[PDB]
Amino acid sequence: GAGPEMVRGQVFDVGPRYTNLSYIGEGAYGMVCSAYDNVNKVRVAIKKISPFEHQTYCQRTLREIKILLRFRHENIIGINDIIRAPTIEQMKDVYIVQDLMETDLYKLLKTQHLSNDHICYFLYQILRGLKYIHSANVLHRDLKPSNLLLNTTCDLKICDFGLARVADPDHDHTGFLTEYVATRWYRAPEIMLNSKGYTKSIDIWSVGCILAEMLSNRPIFPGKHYLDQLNHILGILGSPSQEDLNCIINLKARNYLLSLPHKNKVPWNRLFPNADSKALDLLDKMLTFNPHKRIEVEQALAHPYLEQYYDPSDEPIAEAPFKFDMELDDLPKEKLKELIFEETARFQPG
Ligand SMILES: Nc1n[nH]c2nnc(-c3c(-c4ccccc4)nn4ccccc34)cc12
């Protein structure tokens, strides 16, 4: 005596364990809703995804699920359950379940003005979790405000590993103006110059952009298109020094920068008048042009601005490094569906 239940767009087949559905969001890659978790009496967040039609959609699903299930950390969202049909043939949509988190950084910065206390705390939690992911040789590659979940009690947890992958520094070099998929406003300068984003330094840059954005409730470098994003970065940072030209071997990247007029660095304090100086000093180190000089995660956690929370022994690392034997492109949608099936088998009764 009941029903399957539909939200707004379409049906949600997740009974009987979860009920009382409420629409939350939907942005291309699935619809997010809020359900009631019977058994473990607590509300939860559940996302319906129908990726099998598209290749791209299938990669995003596998990375997220394989990574999330493998990771175990307080500042990274975990997967409680995964619903889908008993066979590959009957599987069209997958439902992933996570603890319910009232909001995210993106939604919170639209109206609330974070105080220094809350900024410092949120930055710490961001870095604590990043230390764990980097320690497993993984790069999130798409850290942004909407990727950070927040409880009402301020516990912050990272969540979108759709474009995440295994480090791999040896193959980071690429040509000038190489296409990229991760969110524009958070891409480091080298992405547009000579990098594919295969090193840990790329997440740090994104984190710094999230620091700045927390400090003034608006994107630090809001580019409108590919090369405009680098124009925004260079606008504030100034012209890159000549003295240190670490990397940047391809002549096209070097020549482009070399053809810009000299532009001086806009001082941090000028952009953020009323803001702790220690926070600004870290911000500087996180947003340094040169990716080799850029500060790394553990080093960031040890910065004076974060001294109230810093404690190495309470900042766990992964028990074992992550291995992605699936390759970037190469892998048809069919096998991806199989891996997804296999990856999610543990949640089937048995
Ligand atoms: N845990 C959450 N509570 N409320 C939320 N709103 N959006 C998210 C969320 C999910 C998602 C939702 C349910 C299950 C699996 C993935 N995927 N995802 C991808 C990009 C940005 C946010 C986000 C997470 C939560």
From Swiss-Prot:
Description of activity control: Phosphorylated by MAP2K1/MEK1 and MAP2K2/MEK2 on Thr-178 and Tyr-180 in response to external stimuli like insulin or NGF. Both phosphorylations are required for activity. This phosphorylation causes dramatic conformational changes, which enable full activation and interaction of MAPK1/ERK2 with its substrates. Phosphorylation on Ser-22 by SGK1 results in its activation by enhancing its interaction with MAP2K1/MEK1 and MAP2K2/MEK2. Dephosphorylated and inactivated by DUSP1, DUSP3, DUSP6 and DUSP9. Inactivated by pyrimidylpyrrole inhibitors.
Top-level taxon in the UniProt lineage: Eukaryota
Pfam families for this protein: Pkinase
Variant or mutagenesis effect after changing residue 67 to N: In NS13; results in increased MAPK signaling; reduced interaction with DUSP6; no effect on interaction with MAP2K1
Residues with Phosphoserine modification: 22, 239, 241, 277
Protein kinase domain mapped to chain residues: 18-306
Entry keyword Hydrolase: no
Protein name: Mitogen-activated protein kinase 1
Organism listed in the record: Homo sapiens
